[PDB]
Design a protein around this ligand. Structure first.
Ligand SMILES: COc1nc(C(=O)NCC(=O)O)c(O)c2ccc(Oc3cccc(CN)c3)cc12
Lengths: 240, 12
């Protein structure tokens, strides 16, 4: 029922714009994409691990940019900005890949260019997380999300008040509740033909947050396997 | 630790 207020319509546009400006190859991702050769990532695999280390940095960096284009993120202490980014990075990157799931070739596109299979992402170091991301990919196609809806989810993941060690807990929560509200209102406006769109979308926050945690455990097992190999931003963000 | 992120966050 309730559609978005004037103030929320502007937040919607601020968060929509931060996403489209930091999303690799914007609209052209379908035309830019180049399938990873099937000989890379069969059955740890160091040749596939190398393709993935090449795009990990730019992907972390695009999330940093997305947050910086959000005024409320910029009103925060730099020590909170760091915790928030370190919490959502793998989440936002897993949603960006998953919304570029192609059921025709069953591939996710990473960095707006590299199409990969379940197995390549799995054997290239991400192990069982690949299955989680691919599965959210399969699941999120039914919902036909637009950029605005992908952005509001990112903002909800980013504005997580429960991040270990953060100081402005109450204000981050206020910021997340603002986003959640505009989001619900925008789903109403967008008149989707799915009863209970809103709640079913929100629970995808669960999926993403598990992918976050599941990745933080895989990083302990990427360290008993493949450290001079991991790019420098990857080690900052995914360690403490 | 958070040097690159502090660079990325203070940039532009
Ligand atoms: C969702 O996870 C990922 N997402 C993206 C991405 O581009 N998402 C789409 C987007 O943001 O538009 C990547 O580029 C990733 C690259 C390496 C990676 O995992 C590995 C695997 C092996 C080594 C390393 C780095 N040491 C990382 C995971 C990635």
């Amino acid at each position: 029922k309730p559609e978005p207020t004037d103030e929320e319509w502007e937040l919607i546009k601020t968060v929509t714009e931060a996403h489209v400006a930091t999303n690799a190859q914007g609209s052209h991702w379908k035309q830019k994409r180049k399938f990873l050769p099937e000989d890379i990532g069969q059955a740890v695999d160091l040749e596939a691990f190398s393709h993935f280390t090449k795009i990990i940095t730019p992907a972390i960096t695009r999330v940093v940019d997305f947050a910086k284009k959000l005024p409320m993120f910029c009103e925060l202490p730099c020590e909170d900005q760091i915790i928030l980014l370190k919490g959502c990075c793998m989440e936002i990157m897993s949603l960006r890949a998953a919304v570029r799931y192609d059921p025709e070739s069953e591939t996710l596109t990473l960095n707006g260019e590299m199409a990969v299979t379940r197995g390549q992402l799995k054997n290239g170091g991400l192990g069982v997380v690949s299955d989680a991301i691919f599965d959210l990919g399969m699941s999120l196609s039914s919902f036909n999300l637009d950029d605005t809806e992908v952005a509001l989810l990112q903002a909800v993941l980013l504005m997580s008040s429960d991040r270990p060690g953060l100081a402005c807990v109450e204000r981050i929560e206020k910021y997340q509740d603002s986003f959640l509200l505009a989001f619900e209102h925008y789903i109403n406006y967008r008149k989707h033909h799915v009863t209970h769109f809103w709640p079913k979308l929100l629970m995808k926050v669960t999926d993403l947050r598990m992918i976050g945690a599941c990745h933080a455990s895989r990083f302990l097992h990427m360290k008993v396997e493949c450290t001079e190999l991991f790019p420098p931003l990857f080690l900052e963000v995914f360690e403490d | 630790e958070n040097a690159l992120l502090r660079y990325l966050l203070d940039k532009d």
